[PDB]
Ligand binder design. Structure first.
Ligand SMILES: CCCCCCCCCCCCCCCCCC(=O)OC[C@H](COP(=O)([O-])OCC(O)COP(=O)([O-])OC[C@@H](COC(=O)CCCCCCCCCCCCCCCCC)OC(=O)CCCCCCCCCCCCCCCCC)OC(=O)CCCCCCCCCCCCCCCCC
Ligand SMILES: CCCCCCCCCCCCCCCCCC(=O)OC[C@H](COP(=O)([O-])OCC(O)COP(=O)([O-])OC[C@@H](COC(=O)CCCCCCCCCCCCCCCCC)OC(=O)CCCCCCCCCCCCCCCCC)OC(=O)CCCCCCCCCCCCCCCCC
Ligand SMILES: CCCCCCCCCCCCCCCCCC(=O)OC[C@H](COP(=O)([O-])OCC(O)COP(=O)([O-])OC[C@@H](COC(=O)CCCCCCCCCCCCCCCCC)OC(=O)CCCCCCCCCCCCCCCCC)OC(=O)CCCCCCCCCCCCCCCCC
Ligand SMILES: CCCCCCCCCCCCCCCCCC(=O)OC[C@H](COP(=O)([O-])OCC(O)COP(=O)([O-])OC[C@@H](COC(=O)CCCCCCCCCCCCCCCCC)OC(=O)CCCCCCCCCCCCCCCCC)OC(=O)CCCCCCCCCCCCCCCCC
Ligand SMILES: CCCCCCCCCCCCCCCCC[C@@H](O)O[C@H](CO[C@H](O)CCCCCCCCCCCCCCC)COP(=O)(O)OCC[N+](C)(C)C
Ligand SMILES: CCCCCCCCCCCCCCCCC[C@@H](O)O[C@H](CO[C@H](O)CCCCCCCCCCCCCCC)COP(=O)(O)OCC[N+](C)(C)C
Ligand SMILES: CCCCCCCC/C=C\CCCCCCCC(=O)OC[C@H](COP(=O)(O)OCCN)OC(=O)CCCCCCC/C=C\CCCCCCCC
Ligand SMILES: CCCCCCCC/C=C\CCCCCCCC(=O)O[C@H](COC(=O)CCCCCCC/C=C/CCCCCCCC)COP(=O)(O)OCCN
Ligand SMILES: N[C@@H](Cc1ccc(O)cc1)C(=O)O
Lengths: 56, 55, 104, 347, 458, 140, 53, 69, 122
């Protein structure tokens, strides 16, 4: 019977899906501005024995 | 005196009046080729003297 | 015809309370009306208002007010201990500034 | 008219324009103009009536005078330099005559009077052709001889065209005359930036052509030539009036619509040179075109005008002929601003 | 900050794919969720801004404005569904589409990093507002109002555009961070004076400045209720935000270019407050109130001090909420009696007590009763003006006396006295209207509880 | 032509007011003659003598406006000893506007012409001072 | 504006008649053949702006 | 709240540094392009603003029935 | 003025010189290509609306062809635009390199040696 319920209330995932996609695109945008990661004079730091990058 | 009359009078009403008068002046032609071909002759002579003689 | 045009008469306004004495003023459909009331009240007061106020009230100190207060406390302690003036009229060291050679 | 003969005449018009566009010899350019005019005259007279005959006669007189001045300028240039190649136009008097002849062909002010009359006297299809395809050849020649232009004369004519287009369009209830005055103003905008950057001229021409095609096709779809007949369209097909309203807003130059892109670009180009006062004047003047576009939008889409009883019968029938390029034309007329940098491909 | 932009763009097809009798519910629910998401932008730093990408950034000045926009959308939806009941489904969806597009344009306007992108979005906000006014307004004057709304704006903004591109040819950038870091003084020449005027007049006509304000009573009276809400609450603040952004490149010319505008603002604040005392239309009174408060904001921006900037930010937020609430309160009576004349329906406290309480609270916030954020902004601006010149306390003082008068006048005319005998169609207040009033007023006092969130970057 | 413009502009601001007034009068007369030519072409006057009357009216109006502007601007510059000041041009423009208003016998025309012509003349003076170009030569 | 169809296809639709120093019938020379030839050879390939000086 | 919804200040700091570098480089490039355009249009010695001249390949280098051309 | 018409070596009607093959092609997920596909989808929806057909469901093959054609043209348009901008940058850098007298790198001064006027705000 979920067919009618789905075809009546499938418009309720558009905005949450848009929120998730916007978060993903913001992370992708952050990925393109790492030219000074761990390179500023104020925050330059030696890496821990395990961690690869200071922030993502 | 101010908000309903003079502030209306200076900026928007004057602009509307001027644009309407210029529209009436520009658009009201009889459609006779004689008149604006004479206008073309005047334009050609003026463009030959004012802009062309000075190079 | 002594008329100017064929037009519908202006209709009277409908009272939502006539067909629904407890009508909430959202819709003429009583069920849609009730659920509109419910969603407005739940997502406006219960979610955004109270939870948003709580979230804003406990926002972490990214404005660095407490950090600045602690730094000022350390500075005042040090300067009062060594007898230096609490603040200097110059915020930049003059040895790093080169004035113009001639003022005449 | 026979469909075969009509196709042949349209092909001859296009062939004359193409000959103008591909020629290196001034004589061949003049021949292209002659052939274009000869084939264009009967196309304006396709639906025979006194108004069409009057429009064709006025058009012929204007274009023949322009072509005579064109040939005289060519011959003067040859006299002072034995050159036939379209180039920097070694003589200034010949260059002035050439500029005046091309402006008369384009309908720039003050050689603007014939455009509203010819547009009003012909059918909507002929008006579409006249206001879109007929601008290509003179603008191509002007782009080729731009380095020798006298900026004072062309800028004067462009500013006059913008002013006169706005003022004349303010007074019109006939849709064809509104389109003609809009065309005059847009030609003024196109020629204002020509001495500085021909790529901007091409971009403005392309956007104007797209918007004009969408406008004329929407006007043909709803058989309206007056404001009052267009005010009935909402009671037959509201989608057409809504698309028309958005297209009018774009033609008015409002952001974020596509019609804002050329003016913006042109203004920027003019500030790369010094040229500060003229762009400000041009924008403030284009506000007039926006005003009468908005009045048309008020009449046709934003309010509902009274209708007639017989309109009920029109509800029972559908449009037979369908324009295949109308949706793409509307989309390109409205939603193209985000792709502005693609103008680099024009140069 | 695509996590806010994309959900609104998703509101668009969600509205256009909804069932005919679920459009309001879905739009309201997801608008409220988007407001809740946008609440996270209030976490700001003390040194610089949140630089999300090359295109968008958030400051301590724009974040409360974004929160106000996203919160105003559901209130507009709630206020609109009463008078649009007879409308067809497609036209209702088109109206909601206009509201959503306006929100999207405002959200992108408040966060654009470049001045030309800001200009493009700040002009793009014009189209949905004009369509709403001229298509869903009630009287024949709306058409004229639309024209007054359009050209008054464009005649200010077309010069600005020119100036903007000119600046980009001189400094090489319109990025706001680059503009701030590479700032250079403006010399005293005629060219610089006209550049200053081109950079200032568009925002001046947006506020609006006294003398350039005639479009506002027309547009805000002839518009439907949601149009008036968004015009008073958010669209007037575009001018103030743009002025506070653009003034970073105008020093030290402002030091003397502000005098005519300061004189106009102070005297016209007195004048519009006086006009409010003799007004027969209830909506026009609220519009002229907006003009007076915006004159205060203009003075604060023009004197260019940290206290004045904080006061301007607080006053813009407080005025947005208060004026939107007042417009909704007037709309309830208009929907009951179909007339905007203030003296037509009187003694409404006897018939509608809770609505009378809402009226009292709204008029109390209008006259800036302490410790409301209205009063905080007004007092900060007055203190900064006193530092600028001790004589200003005269004019400001007079304003404080007049405002309360007309404010209470409005209340006393509508709620007190005896009811009109022949008006027998005043039905009890609906739950929707009471909820609308509460959702307006509670955030005001909650913001009073924590005022540093609306005090700006200074 | 530009010969009249050069004849007017070669004389310094606050010197030889009679010559500057004469040059301004010539410029105004030329403008009025062009205006009358276009008016007669587009609006025929139905009689040769009527055409002469219209030409004389337009030309005299324009020449009077130019003469008043030039004389008043030069005299103001010389009395104030302040050349390169747009106020002199504003005063001359308002004087020309009032002359136009008296010529047409209309108070509203006089006031509007005073304001607009004064503002335009002051703007022109600012342009001469700062080097503003109306017809910018192509640079890039 | 100018679509150089002749250059792209190598057709020579009208270039044969552009200048007087180009392959006349029976090798009949123009009155100013040498002067035009010298000017053309001077100005070839450097552009109009440089050639004008 | 900090652990769940936000990052540390270093991320925003260094992203700001990268954004500022990109924007400053773009501004310098715009100014340089304007200067290059001005010089190229003034002198005509660069790839830009090259206006056509007559092709020298059109000349007939044959005897011309007269020794002096 | 025409900047690039007479650039030496330019083939008249090529639309894509061989040199452009040395540039990285646009990705198939380029946001500009996505916007071109969005324009095609809008064209299909408007086509449905004008023809009085159900806007979203009427012709799926027609809408697919609309989107495909817009994307197909947009790919080559983007390639040509990127090539033109690369050409502009190449020419600018070569010209700056070949005329060092017109582009001097002057000595750098720190802010501790530059005298800037202070304008108080009061
Ligand atoms: C500062 C230096 C100089 C500045 C120059 C620039 C400013 C020029 C100002 C002139 C404005 C003329 C138009 C407005 C006037 C209204 C029309 C009219 O005739 O009413 C007359 C009106 C009273 O007459 P009326 O009968 O009661 O009018 C009622 C009717 O409704 C009126 O009759 P109507 O309504 O039936 O209409 C008659 C007809 C009349 O038609 C016209 O008048 C045509 C307008 C053209 C005027 C522009 C000439 C200026 C050129 C200057 C060049 C250098 C000069 C040296 O109107 C039309 O048909 C309009 C159709 C539009 C078609 C466009 C064709 C025009 C060609 C384009 C312009 C010129 C092109 C030149 C080169 C182009 C090449 C690219 O008032 C006057 O008498 C004024 C006449 C002239 C005064 C001009 C003031 C000049 C002051 C200069 C002082 C010097 C300063 C010191 C310098 C240092
Ligand atoms: C390389 C490119 C350049 C190439 C171009 C150059 C080529 C040069 C070749 C010249 C060789 C001539 C060859 C023959 C040409 C064919 C002419 C022809 O067939 O006439 C047809 C034409 C129509 O024939 P229709 O229909 O059988 O007769 C109708 C009735 O005549 C009239 O019927 P209505 O009584 O009902 O109408 C009233 C009457 C009304 O008549 C009038 O209103 C005219 C009175 C205006 C007074 C003039 C101002 C006085 C002071 C100004 C002096 C300036 C310098 C000093 C400065 C100020 C001093 C303080 O007439 C009109 O309204 C018609 C307008 C005609 C006026 C003249 C048109 C020329 C341009 C407009 C000038 C307007 C004057 C304003 C000031 C501008 C500068 C002068 O006849 C005429 O319009 C008059 C005859 C003209 C022939 C002699 C002059 C030829 C002009 C050639 C260029 C110079
Ligand atoms: C955002 C905040 C607000 C901003 C905007 C709001 C405020 C501004 C807008 C409101 C005011 C602007 C209105 C401007 C004038 C309007 C006239 C008009 O519309 O004409 C159409 C209208 C249509 O008439 P019509 O169809 O042509 O013929 C029928 C006539 O009505 C039948 O006429 P009639 O036979 O009955 O008699 C007419 C006759 C005589 O009229 C009469 O019969 C009665 C007497 C009235 C004349 C009063 C003059 C003597 C008293 C003045 C005392 C000093 C002034 C106060 C300042 C004190 C300084 C400490 O008048 C004349 O002959 C004119 C001769 C010129 C003398 C007066 C002009 C002086 C100009 C002021 C100079 C100020 C310089 C700056 C000072 C700085 C220090 C503060 O004309 C009139 O009816 C009115 C005629 C008299 C108006 C002139 C009065 C001037 C008022 C002061 C102007 C200040 C503002 C402009 C300054 C900026 C310009 C660069
Ligand atoms: C900026 C960010 C991005 C924004 C992009 C730009 C905006 C959106 C794109 C624009 C183009 C798209 C739509 C074009 C075709 C629409 C034409 C139409 O008539 O629509 C009717 C049509 C309903 O017709 P129906 O279903 O067959 O049955 C109803 C009858 O036909 C009943 O029909 P009727 O004809 O009998 O009803 C008469 C009605 C018919 O008149 C109209 O419907 C007006 C439509 C005009 C089309 C717009 C003009 C051209 C585009 C330029 C837009 C400029 C935008 C820039 C800002 C400036 C604003 C102007 O006329 C009136 O009632 C007069 C009202 C007067 C108001 C005048 C205002 C009109 C201009 C407003 C335009 C605003 C933008 C579009 C609004 C949405 C329209 C659906 O609407 C739709 O349902 C289609 C829209 C929704 C489909 C898309 C959904 C995608 C799939 C869902 C999942 C999403 C995937 C997400 C991925 C993640 C996976 C989970
Ligand atoms: C209805 C409300 C609309 C909005 C209000 C907008 C307000 C705009 C007002 C502009 C404020 C000042 C503008 C320019 C600053 C000074 C103006 C001038 O009066 O001051 C003197 C200028 O001297 C003289 O006054 C010359 C100017 C006179 C001509 C201007 C015309 C003003 C007349 C009034 C016309 C109304 C304008 C508004 C139309 C609506 C100062 O002497 P000076 O040191 O040498 O000039 C400084 C500039 N320098 C250094 C480059 C030389
Ligand atoms: C309003 C929207 C505008 C859209 C306009 C119509 C779009 C569809 C038309 C499709 C164009 C077909 C051309 C593809 C076939 C190859 C032809 C090629 O050989 O021509 C080249 C020319 O390439 C074309 O110019 C490129 C056409 C692309 C135009 C699009 C730019 C529009 C501006 C940005 C707005 C966004 C557009 C979005 C597209 C849907 C040769 O260059 P060249 O012979 O040496 O130039 C001669 C003229 N010169 C020398 C004076 C310059
Ligand atoms: C140099 C040229 C400068 C160009 C400036 C043009 C300003 C742009 C606005 C154009 C307004 C045109 C209005 C007009 O002229 O018509 C008068 C019109 C007649 O009504 P219609 O609708 O045409 O007739 C319908 C019934 N038959 O009268 C009116 O009532 C107009 C009502 C709306 C007018 C609104 C104008 C608001 C102007 C605000 C200030 C902006 C002025 C622009 C310049 C600012 C100064 C730098
Ligand atoms: C509804 C009412 C709204 C009214 C708003 C309109 C008023 C806006 C102010 C006027 C805009 C003019 C500025 C244009 C852009 C300025 C950019 C600039 O800086 O250019 C200057 C040049 O400045 C100018 O040329 C501008 C001169 C003015 C020409 C246009 C006049 C418009 C009307 C002027 C009076 C009105 C202004 C105030 C009106 C207030 C609102 C009523 C520098 O150029 P350069 O040549 O390189 O200088 C150094 C080398 N010589
Ligand atoms: N601009 C101010 C804003 C502020 C106001 C009050 C506060 O408590 C904190 C911050 C800083 O400092």
């Amino acid at each position: 019977n979920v067919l009618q319920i789905v075809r009546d209330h499938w418009v309720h995932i558009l905005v949450p899906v848009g929120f998730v996609f916007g978060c993903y695109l913001d992370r992708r945008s952050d990925e393109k501005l790492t030219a000074f990661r761990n390179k500023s004079l104020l925050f330059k730091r030696e890496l821990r024995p395990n961690e690869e990058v200071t922030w993502k | 005196l101010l908000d309903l009359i003079w502030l209306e009078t200076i900026l928007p009403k004057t602009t509307s009046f001027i644009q309407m008068k210029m529209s009436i002046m520009v658009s009201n032609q009889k459609g006779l080729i004689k008149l604006y071909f004479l206008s073309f002759l005047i334009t050609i002579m003026i463009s030959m003297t004012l802009f062309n003689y000075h190079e | 015809p002594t008329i100017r045009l064929q037009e519908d008469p202006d209709p009277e306004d409908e009272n939502l309370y006539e067909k629904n004495p407890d009508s909430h003023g959202y819709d003429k459909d009583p069920i849609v009306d009730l659920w509109n009331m419910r969603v407005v009240f739940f997502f406006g007061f219960s979610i955004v208002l109270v939870l948003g106020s709580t979230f804003v009230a406990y926002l972490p100190d990214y404005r660095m007010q407490e950090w600045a207060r602690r730094e000022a406390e350390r500075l005042v302690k040090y300067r009062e201990a060594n007898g230096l003036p609490l603040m200097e009229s110059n915020c930049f060291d003059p040895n790093k500034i080169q004035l113009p050679e001639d003022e005449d | 008219m026979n469909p075969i003969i009509y196709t042949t005449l349209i092909m001859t018009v296009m062939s004359g324009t193409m000959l103008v566009m591909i020629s290196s010899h001034w004589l061949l350019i003049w021949i292209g103009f002659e052939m274009n005019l000869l084939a264009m005259i009967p196309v304006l007279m396709k639906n025979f009536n006194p108004r069409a005959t009057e429009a064709a006669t006025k058009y012929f007189l204007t274009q023949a005078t322009a072509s005579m001045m064109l040939m005289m300028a060519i011959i003067i240039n040859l006299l002072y330099s034995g050159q036939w190649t379209i180039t920097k136009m070694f003589n200034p008097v010949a260059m002035t005559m050439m500029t005046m002849a091309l402006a008369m062909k384009l309908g720039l002010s003050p050689f603007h009077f014939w455009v509203p009359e010819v547009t009003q006297g012909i059918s909507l299809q002929a008006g579409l052709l006249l206001l879109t395809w007929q601008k290509l050849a003179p603008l191509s020649v002007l782009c080729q001889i731009s380095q020798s232009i006298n900026p004072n004369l062309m800028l004067t004519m462009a500013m006059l065209s913008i002013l006169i287009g706005g003022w004349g369009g303010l007074n019109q209830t006939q849709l064809r005359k509104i389109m003609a005055y809009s065309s005059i103003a847009h030609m003024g905008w196109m020629t204002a930036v020509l001495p500085y950057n021909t790529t901007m001229t091409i971009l403005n021409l392309l956007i104007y052509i797209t918007m004009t095609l969408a406008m004329f096709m929407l006007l043909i779809h709803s058989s309206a030539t007056t404001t009052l007949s267009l005010s009935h369209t909402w009671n037959k097909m509201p989608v057409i009036t809504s698309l028309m309203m958005v297209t009018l807003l774009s033609m008015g130059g409002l952001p974020p619509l596509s019609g804002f892109m050329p003016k913006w670009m042109i203004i920027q180009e003019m500030t790369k040179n010094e040229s500060i006062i003229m762009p400000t004047l041009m924008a403030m003047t284009a506000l007039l075109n926006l005003y009468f576009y908005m009045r048309l939008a008020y009449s046709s889409s934003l309010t509902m005008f009274p209708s007639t009883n017989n309109m009920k019968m029109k509800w029972q029938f559908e449009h037979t002929k369908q324009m295949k390029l109308l949706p793409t034309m509307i989309v390109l007329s409205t939603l193209v601003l985000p792709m502005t940098p693609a103008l680099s491909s024009l140069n | 900050m695509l996590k806010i932009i994309i959900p609104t763009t998703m509101l668009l097809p969600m509205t256009w794919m909804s069932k005919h009798n679920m459009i309001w519910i879905n739009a309201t629910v997801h608008s409220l969720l988007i407001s809740l998401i946008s609440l996270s932008l209030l976490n700001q730093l003390g040194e610089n801004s949140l630089n999300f990408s090359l295109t968008f950034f958030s400051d301590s000045l724009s974040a409360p404005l974004l929160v106000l926009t996203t919160w105003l959308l559901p209130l507009m939806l709630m206020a609109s569904q009463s008078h649009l009941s007879k409308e067809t489904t497609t036209r209702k969806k088109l109206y909601i589409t206009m509201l959503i597009l306006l929100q999207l344009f405002l959200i992108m306007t408040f966060t654009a990093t470049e001045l030309i992108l800001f200009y493009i979005l700040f002009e793009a906000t014009l189209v949905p507002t004009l369509i709403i006014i001229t298509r869903w307004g009630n009287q024949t004057e709306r058409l004229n109002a639309g024209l007054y709304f359009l050209f008054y704006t464009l005649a200010g903004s077309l010069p600005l555009l020119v100036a903007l591109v000119y600046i980009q040819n001189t400094t090489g950038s319109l990025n706001f961070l680059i503009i701030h870091y590479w700032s250079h003084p403006l010399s005293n020449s005629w060219s610089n004076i006209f550049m200053w005027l081109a950079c200032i007049m568009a925002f001046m006509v947006k506020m609006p400045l006294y003398g350039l304000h005639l479009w506002l009573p027309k547009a805000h009276v002839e518009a439907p209720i949601a149009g008036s809400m968004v015009l008073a609450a958010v669209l007037l603040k575009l001018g103030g935000y743009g002025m506070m952004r653009i003034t970073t490149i105008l020093n030290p010319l402002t030091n003397y270019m502000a005098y005519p505008f300061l004189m106009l603002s102070m005297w016209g604040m007195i004048m519009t407050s006086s006009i409010c005392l003799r007004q027969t239309d209830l909506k026009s009174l609220i519009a002229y109130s907006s003009v007076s408060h915006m004159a205060l904001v203009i003075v604060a921006i023009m004197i260019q001090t940290p206290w004045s900037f904080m006061g301007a930010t607080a006053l813009m937020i407080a005025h947005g909420l208060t004026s939107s609430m007042l417009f909704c309160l007037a709309n309830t009576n208009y929907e009951r009696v179909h007339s905007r004349t203030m003296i037509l329906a009187r003694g409404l406290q006897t018939l509608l007590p809770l609505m009378a309480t809402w009226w009292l609270v709204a008029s109390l916030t209008n006259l800036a009763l302490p410790p409301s954020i209205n009063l905080i902004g007004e007092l900060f601006i007055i203190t900064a003006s006193f530092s600028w010149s001790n004589i200003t306390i005269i004019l400001m003082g007079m304003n404080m006396m007049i405002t309360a008068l007309y404010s209470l006048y409005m209340l006393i005319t509508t709620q007190r006295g005896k009811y009109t005998h022949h008006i027998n169609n005043i039905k009890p207040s609906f739950t929707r209207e009471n909820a609308l009033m509460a959702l307006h007023i509670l955030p005001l006092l909650l913001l009073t509880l924590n005022p540093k969130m609306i005090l700006g970057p200074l | 032509a530009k010969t009249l413009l050069h004849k007017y502009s070669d004389i310094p601001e606050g010197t030889e007011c009679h010559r500057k007034a004469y040059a301004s009068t010539s410029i105004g007369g030329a403008t009025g003659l062009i205006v009358s030519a276009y008016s007669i072409a587009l609006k025929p006057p139905a009689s040769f003598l009527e055409g002469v009357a219209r030409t004389g009216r337009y030309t005299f109006t324009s020449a009077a406006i130019g003469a008043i502007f030039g004389l008043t601007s030069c005299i103001s510059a010389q009395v104030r000893e302040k050349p390169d000041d747009p106020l002199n041009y504003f005063i001359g423009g308002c004087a020309g506007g009032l002359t136009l208003g008296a010529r047409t016998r209309s108070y509203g025309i006089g006031a509007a012409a005073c304001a607009y012509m004064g503002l335009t003349a002051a703007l022109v003076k600012m342009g001469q001072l700062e080097g503003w170009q109306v017809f910018a030569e192509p640079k890039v | 504006p100018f679509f150089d169809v002749q250059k792209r296809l190598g057709l020579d639709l009208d270039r044969w008649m552009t200048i007087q120093s180009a392959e006349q019938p029976h090798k009949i020379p123009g009155r100013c053949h040498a002067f035009e030839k010298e000017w053309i050879e001077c100005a070839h390939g450097i552009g109009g702006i440089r050639a004008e000086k | 709240i900090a652990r769940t919804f936000y990052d540390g200040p270093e991320k925003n700091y260094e992203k700001t540094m990268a954004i500022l570098q990109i924007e400053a480089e773009k501004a310098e490039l715009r100014l340089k392009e304007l200067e290059v355009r001005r010089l190229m249009r003034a002198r005509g010695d660069g790839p830009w603003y090259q206006y056509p001249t007559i092709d020298k390949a059109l000349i007939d280098h044959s005897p011309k029935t007269t020794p002096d051309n | 003025m025409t900047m690039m018409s007479g650039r030496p070596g330019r083939v008249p009607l090529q639309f894509l010189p061989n040199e452009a093959r040395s540039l990285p092609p646009p990705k198939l997920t380029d946001p500009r290509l996505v916007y071109m596909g969005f324009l095609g989808y809008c064209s299909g929806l408007i086509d449905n609306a004008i023809r009085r057909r159900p806007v979203v469901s009427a012709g799926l093959h027609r809408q697919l062809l609309y989107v495909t054609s817009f994307v197909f043209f947009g790919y080559y348009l983007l390639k040509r635009q990127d090539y033109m901008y690369a050409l502009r940058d190449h020419d600018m850098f070569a010209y700056v390199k070949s005329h060092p007298e017109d582009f001097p790198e002057k000595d750098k001064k720190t802010y501790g040696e530059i005298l800037e006027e202070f304008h108080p705000v009061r």
